[PDB]
Design an enzyme around this catalytic site. Sequence first.
Site, short mmCIF file in Angstrom:
data_model
loop_
_atom_site.label_atom_id
_atom_site.label_comp_id
_atom_site.label_asym_id
_atom_site.label_seq_id
_atom_site.Cartn_x
_atom_site.Cartn_y
_atom_site.Cartn_z
N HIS B 93 0.78 -1.12 -0.08
CA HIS B 93 -0.06 0.04 -0.02
C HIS B 93 0.60 1.35 -0.07
CE1 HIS B 93 -3.57 -2.18 1.67
NE2 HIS B 93 -3.45 -2.66 0.26
N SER B 97 -0.76 -0.72 -6.44
CA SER B 97 -0.18 -1.82 -7.52
C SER B 97 0.30 -1.10 -8.67
CB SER B 97 -1.48 -2.58 -7.84
OG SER B 97 -2.10 -3.04 -6.79
N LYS B 119 -14.32 -8.15 -9.76
CA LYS B 119 -13.49 -8.98 -10.59
C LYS B 119 -12.80 -10.11 -9.87
CE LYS B 119 -9.27 -8.13 -13.55
NZ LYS B 119 -9.84 -8.75 -14.75
N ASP B 120 -12.36 -9.91 -8.46
CA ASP B 120 -11.58 -10.95 -7.53
C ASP B 120 -12.77 -11.81 -7.23
OD1 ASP B 120 -9.43 -8.86 -5.76
OD2 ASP B 120 -9.54 -9.32 -7.84
N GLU B 163 5.48 -33.82 -3.88
CA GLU B 163 4.11 -33.46 -4.14
C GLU B 163 4.98 -32.68 -5.44
OE1 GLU B 163 0.86 -33.87 -3.36
OE2 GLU B 163 1.98 -35.59 -2.62
C1 HEM Z 1 0.59 -16.21 1.28
C2 HEM Z 1 1.24 -15.61 0.07
C3 HEM Z 1 0.99 -14.29 -0.35
C4 HEM Z 1 -0.03 -13.44 -0.18
C5 HEM Z 1 -1.43 -13.90 0.71
C6 HEM Z 1 0.11 -12.45 -1.14
C7 HEM Z 1 -1.10 -11.56 -1.56
C8 HEM Z 1 -1.06 -10.43 -2.03
C9 HEM Z 1 -1.70 -9.48 -2.32
C10 HEM Z 1 -3.43 -9.71 -2.04
C11 HEM Z 1 -1.49 -8.45 -3.33
C12 HEM Z 1 -2.49 -7.59 -4.04
C13 HEM Z 1 -3.15 -8.18 -5.29
C14 HEM Z 1 -2.28 -8.63 -6.54
O1 HEM Z 1 -1.48 -7.83 -6.91
O2 HEM Z 1 -1.95 -9.83 -6.99
C15 HEM Z 1 0.01 -9.03 -3.41
C16 HEM Z 1 0.75 -8.23 -4.28
C17 HEM Z 1 2.15 -8.43 -4.52
N1 HEM Z 1 2.84 -9.77 -3.92
FE1 HEM Z 1 1.99 -11.16 -3.09
N2 HEM Z 1 1.16 -12.50 -1.96
C18 HEM Z 1 1.75 -13.66 -1.44
C19 HEM Z 1 3.01 -13.98 -1.84
C20 HEM Z 1 4.12 -13.39 -2.68
C21 HEM Z 1 5.13 -13.77 -3.13
C22 HEM Z 1 5.73 -15.28 -3.17
C23 HEM Z 1 5.73 -12.97 -3.84
C24 HEM Z 1 6.70 -12.85 -4.66
C25 HEM Z 1 8.08 -13.69 -4.13
C26 HEM Z 1 4.76 -11.90 -3.97
C27 HEM Z 1 4.94 -10.55 -4.34
C28 HEM Z 1 4.04 -9.66 -4.48
C29 HEM Z 1 4.26 -8.28 -5.45
C30 HEM Z 1 5.83 -7.77 -5.59
C31 HEM Z 1 3.24 -7.78 -5.31
C32 HEM Z 1 2.96 -6.39 -6.25
C33 HEM Z 1 1.77 -6.76 -7.15
C34 HEM Z 1 1.99 -5.62 -8.42
O3 HEM Z 1 2.76 -5.79 -9.34
O4 HEM Z 1 0.95 -4.82 -8.28
N3 HEM Z 1 3.44 -12.06 -3.21
N4 HEM Z 1 0.23 -10.14 -2.76
C1 LIG Z 2 8.07 -34.53 4.64
O1 LIG Z 2 8.18 -34.76 3.26
C2 LIG Z 2 7.09 -33.87 2.47
C3 LIG Z 2 7.24 -33.87 0.99
C4 LIG Z 2 6.43 -33.19 0.61
O2 LIG Z 2 6.38 -33.17 -0.83
O3 LIG Z 2 5.47 -32.47 1.00
C5 LIG Z 2 4.51 -31.54 0.42
C6 LIG Z 2 8.27 -34.82 0.42
C7 LIG Z 2 8.07 -36.18 -0.15
C8 LIG Z 2 8.93 -36.88 -0.76
C9 LIG Z 2 10.20 -36.52 -1.11
C10 LIG Z 2 10.72 -35.09 -0.74
C11 LIG Z 2 9.69 -34.34 0.00
O4 LIG Z 2 10.10 -33.05 0.36
C12 LIG Z 2 10.59 -32.00 -0.18
C13 LIG Z 2 10.98 -31.00 0.58
C14 LIG Z 2 11.75 -29.91 -0.28
O5 LIG Z 2 11.75 -28.89 0.41
C15 LIG Z 2 12.40 -27.89 -0.41
C16 LIG Z 2 11.92 -26.97 -1.38
C17 LIG Z 2 12.47 -25.90 -2.12
C18 LIG Z 2 13.74 -25.62 -1.54
C19 LIG Z 2 14.63 -26.06 -0.56
C20 LIG Z 2 13.91 -27.04 0.09
C21 LIG Z 2 14.53 -27.85 0.96
N1 LIG Z 2 15.04 -28.49 2.04
N2 LIG Z 2 11.95 -30.20 -1.77
C22 LIG Z 2 11.59 -31.14 -2.38
N3 LIG Z 2 10.85 -32.02 -1.43
#
Ligand code: HEM
Ligand SMILES: CO/C=C(/C(=O)OC)c1ccccc1Oc1cc(Oc2ccccc2C#N)ncn1
Lengths: 422, 271, 442, 101, 59, 55, 54, 49
Positions: B93, B97, B119-120, B163
């Site tokens: 915020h 965005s 939209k969402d 997985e």
């Molecule tokens: C439990 C996971 C997460 C939640 C609940 C979450 C939620 C949100 C929400 C609600 C927004 C605003 C809506 C949207 O732009 O989609 C947002 C934006 C954003 N999130 Fe996440 N996010 C998560 C994970 C991540 C991850 C893994 C990344 C990247 C490593 C990330 C990067 C961003 C960025 C950079 C924005 C800006 C979007 C734009 O360009 O306007 N978020 N996120």
């Molecule tokens: C307890 O094992 C859980 C597993 C799983 O897939 O849970 C969703 C699993 C099952 C079989 C073999 C390996 C498993 O666990 C995992 C865990 C794992 O963890 C990472 C993912 C991305 C980066 C680093 C790690 C680590 N450490 N990356 C790949 N396999």
Amino acid sequence: CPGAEDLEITKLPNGLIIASLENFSPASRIGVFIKAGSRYETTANLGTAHLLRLASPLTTKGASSFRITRGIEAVGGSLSVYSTREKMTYCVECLRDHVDTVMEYLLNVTTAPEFRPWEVTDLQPQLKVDKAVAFQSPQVGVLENLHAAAYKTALANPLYCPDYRIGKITSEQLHHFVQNNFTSARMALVGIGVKHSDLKQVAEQFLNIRSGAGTSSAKATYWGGEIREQNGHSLVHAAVVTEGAAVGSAEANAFSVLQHVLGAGPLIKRGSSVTSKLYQGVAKATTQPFDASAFNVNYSDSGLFGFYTISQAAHAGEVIRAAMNQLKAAAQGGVTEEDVTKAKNQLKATYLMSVETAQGLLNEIGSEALLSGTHTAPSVVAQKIDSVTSADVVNAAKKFVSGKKSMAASGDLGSTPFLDEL
Amino acid sequence: YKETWNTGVILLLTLMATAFVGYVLPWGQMSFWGATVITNLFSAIPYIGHTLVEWAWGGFSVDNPTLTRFFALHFLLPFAIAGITIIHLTFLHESGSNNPLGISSDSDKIPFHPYYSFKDILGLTLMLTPFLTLALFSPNLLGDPENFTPANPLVTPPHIKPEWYFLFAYAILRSIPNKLGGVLALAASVLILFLIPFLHKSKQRTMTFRPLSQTLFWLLVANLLILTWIGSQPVEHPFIIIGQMASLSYFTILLILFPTIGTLENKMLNY
Amino acid sequence: TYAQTLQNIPETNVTTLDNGLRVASEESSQPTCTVGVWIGAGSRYENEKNNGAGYFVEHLAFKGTKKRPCAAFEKEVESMGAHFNGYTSREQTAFYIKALSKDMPKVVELLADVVQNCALEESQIEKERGVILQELKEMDNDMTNVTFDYLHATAFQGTALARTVEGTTENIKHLTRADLASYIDTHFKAPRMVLAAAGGISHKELVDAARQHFSGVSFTYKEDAVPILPRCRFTGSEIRARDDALPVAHVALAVEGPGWADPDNVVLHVANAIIGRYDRTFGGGKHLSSRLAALAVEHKLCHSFQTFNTSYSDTGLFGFHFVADPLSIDDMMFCAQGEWMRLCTSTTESEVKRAKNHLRSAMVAQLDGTTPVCETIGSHLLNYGRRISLEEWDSRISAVDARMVRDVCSKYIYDKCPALAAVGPIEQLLDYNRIRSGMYWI
Amino acid sequence: GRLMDRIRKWYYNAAGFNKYGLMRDDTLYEDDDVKEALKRLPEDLYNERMFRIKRALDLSLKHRILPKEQWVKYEEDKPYLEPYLKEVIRERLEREAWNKK
Amino acid sequence: ALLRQAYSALFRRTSTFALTVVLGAVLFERAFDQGADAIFEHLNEGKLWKHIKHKYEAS
Amino acid sequence: MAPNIRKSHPLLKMINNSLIDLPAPSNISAWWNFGSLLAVCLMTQILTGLLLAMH
Amino acid sequence: APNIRKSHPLLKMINNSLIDLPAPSNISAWWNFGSLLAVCLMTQILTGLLLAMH
Amino acid sequence: VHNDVTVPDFSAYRREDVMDATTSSQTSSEDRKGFSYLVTATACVATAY
Ligand code: HEM
Ligand SMILES: CO/C=C(/C(=O)OC)c1ccccc1Oc1cc(Oc2ccccc2C#N)ncn1
Ligand code: HEM
Ligand code: HEM
């Protein structure tokens, strides 16, 4: 080793005068005097001269806004612009060993401004500030209105950008103003603390905006008005003047002397001024605190002469009248041959002391080298001063009691008299 | 948007740890063996290796004291995710965005409601359909049959694989033969995300108007499908070599090509 | 070259009259000159009951002597075009005159007549009594001076230096012809005075004219003895004079300084040059070299600010003062203290290199004219017991380097309990404790 | 020969911002230098840029582009900001350099 | 004067103040533990296994 | 305090400045729908998670 | 803004509630229980998790 | 006027070494700070333990 040097003063083909004096001071002070000011402003570009004054630090074609300030400060230098309604001085100070460095910026500022629009735009809200601090001295407010009541043009122009024009000045106006006034025949490159050959090699092989005298100021038409400012202040500042004498005028010295005779500023701290006829006169009139002095300004094609008086509202009447009676009493031969002698000394001393200052000296030197091209020796100016009869003085006085008066006052004017009640 | 981005990477790491420990709870064969395989990787860290691992296990192998602490962790982390999510949106915020053309949208902004609330919500049902269709018509499509068998420490499953959402990382893991290098390579496969903000060379924000970067982007995506696929295959030829190629190109594309092509494109715009 | 010009500066001649008075001067080729007497007296020498006497005496020093009454006196000075001025501080007083060198001797006579024969007219005293009382009300509206007074009032609470130079309303409403007479007779004495002159004057002609009007000889060893003052204890503390109805707030903060004699004062001044000063009319604006200046500009932190190093015989005040709007006091203070910490911990050769040039230009600029050159001599003698030429100052200033600025500053500023004075709408500035903490860790 | 020119003009059309009616400079990411640069633009240039952008965003939300006729032509693309931006960067590098010395 | 020396050497620069707390803690622990344990065992003579151990300790 | 209670209240004000009166780009696409889905996804996992945890 | 304790979107929160937060100069010991309750809570959650793991 | 304002007497609170108005308070400063800082540094060690 160092000794007695002599005040050289060349003049290049383009009319650019170069004054110079080596007093072996550990510090130098170079300057660029110019024939420019709110006097050459038109209703169309008012305030442009003021803004130009504040624009000294803006980027130039050779140095940037950043480098100018940093560069000068780097060698413990300084750079400032002083100016009247008809002259502008750009000077810099610094230790002898940095003159060449500080010179670049000076040269750049006065001959190569760029007046970039954005820089200019951001700078303007500053006229509002600059002006607000200046107007803290009531002294400055009435003088503005004086020149406005004493003239119909040129000199009537304010020295501080008028309000309605803040933010409306343009880079074009700044440029045109500079192109049409900062011309080689209207500029002088003075310079205390330096060798003349050096200051000369600079002026030439470096200064470029040149030739001619560009825009010429309109004649100073006298109006004789009365501007009054009701603003509440417990103290009322009033100034009543008349057309005086121009600069370079024979009649000048006469007034200057009538100035001291009537009294022009105290010489003894918290002390009363007995030698001051005007002061003493008013003193006998009012009982409360006040102040009164002989006002005298000499311009290119005109001047103003009269008195200025600060006083409690309810006593402005008695105080201004008194200041008047003391002028009439002087125009009717109320001047001893001694008064004229005392004055002449106070004037010579005042003059002589007003040159001990590096600033004061450079100003003196350059003022001549611009509105003349020569340096009147101190003995000569002395010879000119005392060579003023007791008659000349009583005549000057006459000219005032007779001439058309213009008055400027401000405060709680509830008891201040109108110009036609004097 | 550096902080929004970094908190995002943290959300991702926490989400992975959560799913990882959650997966162990049913205590099936893949539950136990996945736990065993992965946690043993760390005994490869120098000096403090075996220590950190045995500490985590609460004993000498994945056993009951590991399960109970994993349940505690699995219950806990999601709340940390919810918390950090608040921070994520708070940083977001600060700027608002970004948009698909990557240029300032201050000249044209609209209130979140009703435009995006609608939209969402629509976006919610559009996704929710495939979700439920899967959970109701093909409940076990994504799960390992091996997990319908109680964990048995004396019977290694033939194919210990994660997985789908971890496969790509599992592939990178096995690409580096050498316990220590693989673990780092694994860690790096995700930690790499913290470097993205520093490898931006383009003068434009998005890839909307950057054709070279766009293909490089889809190469990367395809690269990840390949790693995902490799991660689900046994460690044998040709999968081994293909695995090392995709793992190698994965890091090349993010560390070398993206910043390089970005600069190149700046020159082609006469910048 | 700069170096040479410094060497060729005419030497200051000092000679002592057997009565204890010292005569000094710098002869220039100037038709005009300044001569005056600088006295080692002031409010610090006063006590709880005569506080304001030296100031009350300053108001009479010009209203005529016994040899020539008021009207006569003024008329004699005015008529010769001479300017008579003077002042009185906490540890120094001076009465000097500006006239043509030609009148150097007649001047000297007038001077001596003033310091030695003040009329102290009973009718005059009752008039200057009302005048001083007004000047108090006027000065009361000068926040800057109200602030430095308060700074002293607390920095030196419970001592002589804690008093204002003008004195109290009571002391002024009751001081007597006697007290004034006493003050003069007690303090204005040859051994504690210096007759300095600068301009076109012959040291000889000066001293000759001196012996003639400054005759008063001493008999006992006491009369030839200059009294050592009891030392004033510094106190880290604060005084907050709050008035939200005032437009802008004033804040001054300082730590204890070393006192005239200490060489460190040279470094301290170089330090203050690095920080420097500012005010909304500086054109350099955002490009000013002073970091604090730049910040003030960028963030609109204050209307102005200054650094100072006020020296005294046995002590001093090294600090800074600033004027800001109620809502920017906190940030300004924050940045200001920040710059002090920078001084102690991370000064740069570049910074000092520049601070030095600024300082040089500063010392040179203090000798621009006769009055300012004369003021220097009067002071140098009275405080260092000799004249320190620009050539010397320059030598000392040039030896200063980053490493040295840091050590000196650390030594006087780092982790010290400062003295704080604040006046105006100061709600946003707060807690001595917080400020005290801004005294350490860059 | 005209190789670099064939490539550029090619990338220019490959990029495709001209289909929104945007100038190359309209597409710049607004970092610190670009922001200063924009403050120096003359009012008219600034308002035109603003409309072009607002227009682009509207096309973008509509999932449309301008008719082929309205597309900015490679050779008619006015580099309205590059001049200011270069000066801003020049000034910045001066200060950075100077504050080091 | 120890307080002055302490101040100058240890408490003035924040870096050294932290080093003093760490080094101070390492030394305080070693001493404080030995002392407390010392006290505890004296207040409990011949009650702890440490005390009676010798009677059955003899392989 | 203020006209509408959606801005004055110390809590609604938060709900308003992030889900109602919050300024959003008019041209954001479907790729911007994943944040909210992620949030909803999280509420749902926590919910179903607790329900399973109870057994 | 000058100091990062006010500008930063997070520290700013830590500052406006635990550092630059305006507090009455005369609050007594009865006002010490809110913080103890907070600390009390952090400690229960901590010892609680440690126990939950077994 | 401000000239009539003076700092009350803090003798009831001053530390012994700065009780006398005619003595430099700097000489005992490292002592006063050294003591208070010693208490603090000790609190830290107690807490680090
Ligand atoms: C439990 C996971 C997460 C939640 C609940 C979450 C939620 C949100 C929400 C609600 C927004 C605003 C809506 C949207 O732009 O989609 C947002 C934006 C954003 N999130 Fe996440 N996010 C998560 C994970 C991540 C991850 C893994 C990344 C990247 C490593 C990330 C990067 C961003 C960025 C950079 C924005 C800006 C979007 C734009 O360009 O306007 N978020 N996120
Ligand atoms: C307890 O094992 C859980 C597993 C799983 O897939 O849970 C969703 C699993 C099952 C079989 C073999 C390996 C498993 O666990 C995992 C865990 C794992 O963890 C990472 C993912 C991305 C980066 C680093 C790690 C680590 N450490 N990356 C790949 N396999
Ligand atoms: C970030 C949200 C969460 C994720 C990603 C997640 C993920 C998982 C996964 C991958 C499994 C194993 C699924 C399987 O049986 O194959 C699992 C199991 C489980 N989760 Fe979660 N979970 C989350 C939150 C929660 C929470 C908050 C709780 C409740 C406090 C919880 C309680 C459980 C329980 C009891 C199991 C074991 C029963 C089962 O296997 O179905 N989960 N979770
Ligand atoms: C508001 C904080 C909490 C309160 C008031 C609280 C209170 C209690 C009480 C009254 C008991 C029984 C004590 C006894 O054995 O006689 C208990 C037990 C327990 N609590 Fe908490 N608890 C808190 C937080 C937590 C949390 C967050 C966890 C961990 C997720 C937790 C886990 C446990 C466990 C495992 C037990 C059972 C073992 C035992 O009885 O010692 N508690 N708690």
